[PDB]
Paper text:
To test this hypothesis, we design helical repeat proteins (DHRs) displaying regularly spaced carboxylate arrays on their surfaces and find that both protein monomers and protein-Ca2+ supramolecular assemblies directly nucleate nano-calcite with non-natural {110} or {202} faces while vaterite, which forms first in the absence of the proteins, is bypassed. To enable exploration of the contribution of the size of the protein-mineral interface while keeping the chemical composition and geometry otherwise constant, we employed Designed Helical Repeat (DHR)39 proteins that can be shrunk or extended simply by changing the number of repeating units. In contrast to typically designed protein surfaces containing a mix of positive, negative, and non-charged hydrophilic residues to promote solubility, and to hydrophobic protein surfaces designed to bind other proteins, we designed surfaces consisting entirely of carboxylate side chains spaced at regular intervals to mimic the carbonate sublattice on different crystallographic planes of CaCO3 crystals (see “Methods”). Here, we describe the design of DHR proteins that template growth of CaCO3 crystals.
Flat repeat helix-turn-helix-turn protein backbones were designed with either constrained monte-carlo fragment assembly with RosettaRemodel40, or by placing α-helices in a plane and then connecting them with additional secondary structural elements. Two designs, [name] and FD31, which were monodisperse in size exclusion chromatography experiments (SEC) were selected for detailed characterization. Circular dichroism (CD) experiments showed the expected alpha-helical structure, and the proteins were found to be hyperstable, remaining folded at temperatures up to 95 °C. The crystal structure of [name] was solved at 4 Å resolution and matched the design model with an RMSD of 0.45 Å with a perfectly straight repeating structure having a 8.7 Å spacing between helices in adjacent repeat subunits. In contrast, [name] did not alter the crystallization pathway from that seen with the no protein and BSA controls. In contrast, in the presence of (j) [name] or a BSA control (j) only vaterite is formed (k, l). We found that the spacing of the designed sidechain arrays with similar chemistry had a pronounced effect: [name] with an array spacing of 0.9 nm did not template calcite, DHR49-Neg with a spacing of 1.0 nm templated calcite to some extent, and FD31 with a 1.1 nm spacing was a strong nucleator of calcite.
Author numbering: 1 to 384
The structure:
Amino acid sequence: EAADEARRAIEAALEEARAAADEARSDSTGETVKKAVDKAEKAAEDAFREIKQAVNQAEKQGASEAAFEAFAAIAAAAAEAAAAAFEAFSDSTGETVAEAVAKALKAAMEAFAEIAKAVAQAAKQGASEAAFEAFAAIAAAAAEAAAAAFEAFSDSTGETVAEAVAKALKAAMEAFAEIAKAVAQAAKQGASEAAFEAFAAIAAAAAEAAAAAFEAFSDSTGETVAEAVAKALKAAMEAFAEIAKAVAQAAKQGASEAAFEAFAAIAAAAAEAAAAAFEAFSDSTGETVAEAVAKALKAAMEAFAEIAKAVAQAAKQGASEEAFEKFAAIAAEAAEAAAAAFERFSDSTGETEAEKVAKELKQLMEEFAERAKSVAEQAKNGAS
């Protein structure tokens, strides 16, 4: 009766979303408003039908009852994210605003369906209940970021502002889907519960940086600033995705607990640096300063991905605990440097000073990645 309670809860979430689609629809009369709402309402339904199917695919493969409790936790977060893409819609009724609203709700829905299928894959691969708790945490983090993207949208109605908002919400969604897939691969590879705890922290660290970039967007509706915010959030998302994949490869290698701890600290160091580059953007609405900001965050999203790929290569070699600590200390030292290049830029918005501090953050990022790679190659030889 466990999968039965899951299907009924799944049908309570789909129903709670259609009512939310109706709750936003009674307060709208423009034709383009009802169009995109019917588009957004059809996107959460094809995702709701895809959730009951994964609840049935793990029934033929009779998963543990922890898989059905994560499917109900994922359906519930699905209903809340549609009601969030609709609560932000309630303050708007323009064509492009509703269009990007439908696009963003379709982005978190396709990401939600992909998470349930990954939960189903681990079910046939009979994972641990720590993977299920990480699945509910990854789904909860997904809802917190889509809702934050909508709240930031509640402050803006610009066509380009809403377009980059939908482009950004899809970026973390595609990043979140890739995280759930890696969680499924390690589930087939039956890794530890320290990996799933770091996976929950990685899902949270993603939400922190996404909400921060949106919080920075709550200060700017200039098309040049919105795209820079969107392209930046995409960089950190592509970074976090690579960090989740690396967290799975060492899980295939079956490493120690200190690795996932440094992986959870690396995801946090990424969040701190991403929010910092956004917090300095809260003091700059010039085009050239905005580009230098997002370009450095791209250089920082590349650096963090390298330091996570390096910590994984030492876990495959079976290294000591001093490596993951030095890896986490390089991640935080990188965060202090990317935050410093942002607060000092808050005292210079001339194009020359912006691209100058940016290029130095790329030179230092390549140096930090060189420092992380040096730490890895030293641990492979058996260093004391």
